[PDB]
């Protein structure tokens, strides 16, 4: 159970942030989710302080992070960091990352 | 028929070289078409001035060492890449640097010529040590469009040049960084409309607003030939 | 299916959803409600034979609230033999099982909109209306005999605006083809009150 | 399958190069495309919500 | 939206009576007996009270002194 | 000191298929203009299409006529594909009346001045009975994009006649757009490119008008950019 700030969207499906799926053990194959509204003011304050997603990044079981990137993210990053022996722009010297982006894009 | 034209063009210019620009609301799908067109035009085709070649009085190859500069030659080339100069009338001009004594040789120490203005007088170039501190060089700056790497000129160097002719990468375009995000924005019933936030960092010379101005201007002059419904 | 196994025709024929010819002949009349076939003289019974008529079934409610409609395949004057498939049942074409539809896919991650097993789809599919299904709900109004008196089905319904009656006939039943919405009065009934 | 693809004048490896329709730059490393027979199952969102 | 309350819990380390003082303040704010000491940016009164707590203007003792005054 | 693109020869291979060329394009603007045009064309081209139909003997989309083999719903599906060119008015009422055995094609529509039936052989229905007769009145509107029935249902505006049959409107004539930038040897220049945009349409919009309107829209948005208030 976690609290989120809603953003109005079209459609009849709830949109769930990807990083938290691991925490929910949620899968997009017809799994459904329930949504409750805290009524009194103390409940609202409790939700925003104690239960909000950003406040729960470490698992209560062990200390390690729960929101680690799962599958697509890690694949993209892996592709990004691996190097190749020979390519375009071998061995030129750049003054910083900004022109690196200039060159790649 | 009747389209939806953008209003409320807000621009938050923190740190004059860094400008965030917000644009809403935009018809469906035009976010990416327009963002990408602008980005490519800004990045690839922009008239500017930049350092092209350099002659060192002391070293014949880029890996040799000059006595009394702790920084290697490559560091000097990298410092010269950052030089943002604006010349007014002449097309190609040759600046001379001659410095002695202890301390940081900065852009200000260049000989003050007529048409050329160095926007950043405090940009470090070299560090000179004690009692010898002899630095002399001739840097040629030219006008051009876009980005020109060293490799493409050095390829076509069958025209043999005297030793010391050190080629430098030409950074003509004044934009150092450009990016655009597109995000959802709804007019009270239609949700599939989008806002374009363009974050741009330039290299001092021109302020971002006017950069955008001439970018949009350029694309419009090319398009001008067909557009006639007015 | 572009890629099948060949069993589709066996399944379609053997299920009772198709209309299959019992005595081969020639199709005399084709309509979108019935197919009338003139039997061939060879197989034609001598005494009191006549011709064969196949009445088709149009949109009715299945157990799952789906539509059960049969379409004719053949045209006027085509010869038919015993055991061929005249009319296609639900989700079958020309005798073959066609459960769904075959579309052009590309295997790639597209800005994490297909992050997990989720699927991205192009607007052309909805524009061309190829995944639109018809469903069918059944509703029942029962007028019993109470001991205070039988209830009535009349169209005279207390303190309802004439807007609600507009779509009702004089007998109190909606007109076939009328467009209704949630909360609209399907049929008018009054419970009698006594004492 | 390879033979049938060749007879149609398509890449024998069954993958083609695709251009991103939104931005226009080419994708590195060509991708697998082709027609697959899909079904819409009875789990329809309007009943679940 | 105020995505983290870490500084408010650093003000009162119990992390529970934080919720109580913030609820009392936000309840004095909603039923309009009091006024916010911070310029609101279209926040609701809960996040306003947390924003006030993190800036050090309000705690339990300030509530008690102001109430008796 | 620049170049500028001039619209050159526009080859027409078929009534639907067309090639449009732009010769003097500066380096780098090839892809920019190609993609911008592709987007505008595919997204924003205005066209006309049938919005709703009334046939006489039919209460609702799901019933059936005597002497026809298609269901009424399939008849609407056939009408959705009807390619028509309207010149002056915004809403036209076409009339189709046919009797006897035969395929009712699009050619049988009552010939009005302002309406052009692009593909007269396009089939609509098949009659199967000597005395079977079909009469119908098709209402055609102008619009952009894709509008379904169900959204317009909010604005019903006295849909009271049960004979009305609403059809989803695909207000868009262009089916496909591709472009190629290839080396444009200009007699006095080294590296120039020419853009060839080949477009496939249903044969209503002429290429020149499409390209002109697309360039117009893009130029308009750029105009919006030229001024910057900063106020
Ligand atoms: Mg699941």
From Swiss-Prot, chain E:
GO terms classed as biological process: bacterial-type flagellum assembly; bacterial-type flagellum-dependent cell motility; cell motility; cellular response to cell envelope stress; DNA-templated transcription initiation; intracellular iron ion homeostasis; nitrate assimilation; protein-containing complex assembly
Domain of life: Bacteria
Catalytic activity from the UniProt record: RNA(n) + a ribonucleoside 5'-triphosphate = RNA(n+1) + diphosphate
GO molecular function: bacterial-type RNA polymerase core enzyme binding; DNA binding; DNA-directed RNA polymerase activity
Keyword Membrane belongs to the record: no
UniProt keyword Transcription, yes or no: yes
EC number(s) per entry: 2.7.7.6
GO CC field: cytosol; cytosolic DNA-directed RNA polymerase complex; RNA polymerase complex; transcription elongation factor complex
Keywords attached to this entry: DNA-directed RNA polymerase, Nucleotidyltransferase, Transcription, Transferase
Subunit structure: The RNAP catalytic core consists of 2 alpha, 1 beta, 1 beta' and 1 omega subunit. When a sigma factor is associated with the core the holoenzyme is formed, which can initiate transcription. The rRNA transcription and antitermination complex (rrnTAC) consists of RNAP, NusA, NusB, NusE (rpsJ), NusG, SubB, ribosomal protein S4, DNA and precursor rRNA; S4 is more flexible than other subunits.
Role of this protein: Promotes RNA polymerase (RNAP) assembly. Latches the N- and C-terminal regions of the beta' subunit thereby facilitating its interaction with the beta and alpha subunits. Part of the processive rRNA transcription and antitermination complex (rrnTAC). The complex forms an RNA-chaperone ring around the RNA exit tunnel of RNAP. It supports rapid transcription and antitermination of rRNA operons, cotranscriptional rRNA folding, and annealing of distal rRNA regions to allow correct ribosome biogenesis.
Family indicated by similarity: Belongs to the RNA polymerase subunit omega family.
Protein name per UniProt: DNA-directed RNA polymerase subunit omega
């Amino acid at each position: 159970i976690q609290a989120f700030e809603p953003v109005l969207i079209e459609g009849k499906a709830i949109q769930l942030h990807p990083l938290v799926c691991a925490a929910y053990n949620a899968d997009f194959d017809g799994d459904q989710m329930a949504v409750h509204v805290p009524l009194t003011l103390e409940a609202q304050l409790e939700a925003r302080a104690l239960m909000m997603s950003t406040n729960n990044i470490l698992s209560p079981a062990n200390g390690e992070p729960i929101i680690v990137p799962s599958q697509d993210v890690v694949l993209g990053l892996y592709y990004m960091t691996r190097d190749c022996v020979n390519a375009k722009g071998e061995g030129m010297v750049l003054t910083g990352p900004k022109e690196a982006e200039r060159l790649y894009r | 028929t009747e389209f939806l034209k953008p209003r409320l063009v807000d621009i938050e210019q923190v740190s004059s070289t860094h400008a965030k620009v917000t644009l809403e609301p935009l018809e469906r799908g035009f976010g990416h078409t327009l963002g990408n067109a602008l980005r490519r035009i800004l990045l690839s085709s922009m008239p500017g001035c930049a350092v092209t070649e350099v002659e060192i009085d002391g070293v014949l190859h880029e890996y040799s060492t000059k006595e009394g500069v702790q920084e290697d030659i490559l560091e000097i080339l990298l410092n010269l890449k950052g030089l943002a100069v604006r010349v007014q009338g002449k097309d190609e001009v040759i600046l001379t640097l001659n410095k002695s004594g202890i301390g940081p040789v900065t852009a200000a120490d260049i000989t003050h010529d007529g048409d050329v203005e160095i926007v950043k007088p405090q940009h470090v170039i070299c560090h000179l040590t004690d009692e010898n501190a002899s630095i002399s060089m001739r840097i040629k700056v030219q006008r051009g469009r876009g980005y020109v790497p060293a490799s493409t000129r050095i390829h076509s160097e069958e025209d043999e040049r005297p030793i010391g002719r050190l080629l430098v990468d030409a950074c003509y375009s004044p934009v150092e960084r450009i990016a655009y995000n597109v995000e959802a924005a709804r007019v009270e019933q239609r949700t599939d409309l989008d806002k374009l936030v363009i974050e741009m960092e330039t290299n001092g010379t021109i302020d971002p607003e006017e950069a955008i101005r001439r970018a949009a201007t350029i694309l419009a002059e090319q398009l001008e030939a067909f557009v006639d419904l007015r | 299916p572009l890629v099948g196994t060949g069993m589709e025709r066996a399944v379609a024929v053997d299920s009772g959803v198709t209309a299959v010819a019992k005595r081969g002949g020639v199709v005399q009349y084709v309509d979108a409600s019935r197919i009338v076939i003139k039997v061939n003289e060879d197989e034609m019974y001598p005494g009191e034979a006549g011709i064969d008529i196949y009445n088709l079934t149009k949109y009715t409610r299945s157990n799952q609230n789906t539509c059960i409609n049969q379409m004719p395949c053949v045209s006027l004057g085509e010869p038919v033999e015993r055991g061929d498939v005249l009319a296609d049942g639900p989700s079958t074409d020309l005798g073959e099982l066609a459960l769904g539809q075959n579309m052009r896919v590309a295997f790639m991650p597209w800005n994490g909109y297909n992050f997990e097993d989720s699927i991205l789809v192009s607007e052309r599919v909805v524009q061309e209306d190829r995944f639109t299904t018809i469903h069918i709900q059944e509703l029942a109004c029962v007028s019993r005999d109470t001991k205070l008196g039988p209830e009535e089905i009349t169209a005279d319904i207390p303190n309802v605006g004439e807007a609600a009656l507009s779509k009702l006939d004089e007998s109190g039943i909606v007109y076939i083809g009328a467009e209704v919405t949630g909360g609209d009065i399907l049929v008018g009934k009054v419970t009698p009150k006594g004492e | 399958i390879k033979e049938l693809l060749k007879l149609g004048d398509l890449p024998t490896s069954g993958q083609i190069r695709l251009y991103d329709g939104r931005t226009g730059e080419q994708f590195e490393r060509p991708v697998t495309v082709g027609y697959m027979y899909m079904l819409k199952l009875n789990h329809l969102v309007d009943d679940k919500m | 939206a105020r995505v983290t309350v870490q500084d408010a819990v650093e003000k009162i380390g119990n992390r529970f009576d934080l919720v109580l003082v913030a609820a009392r303040r936000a309840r004095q704010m909603q039923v309009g007996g009091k006024d916010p000491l911070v310029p609101e940016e279209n926040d609701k009164t809960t996040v306003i009270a947390l924003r006030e707590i993190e800036e050090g203007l309000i705690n339990n003792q300030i509530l008690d002194v102001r109430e008796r005054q």
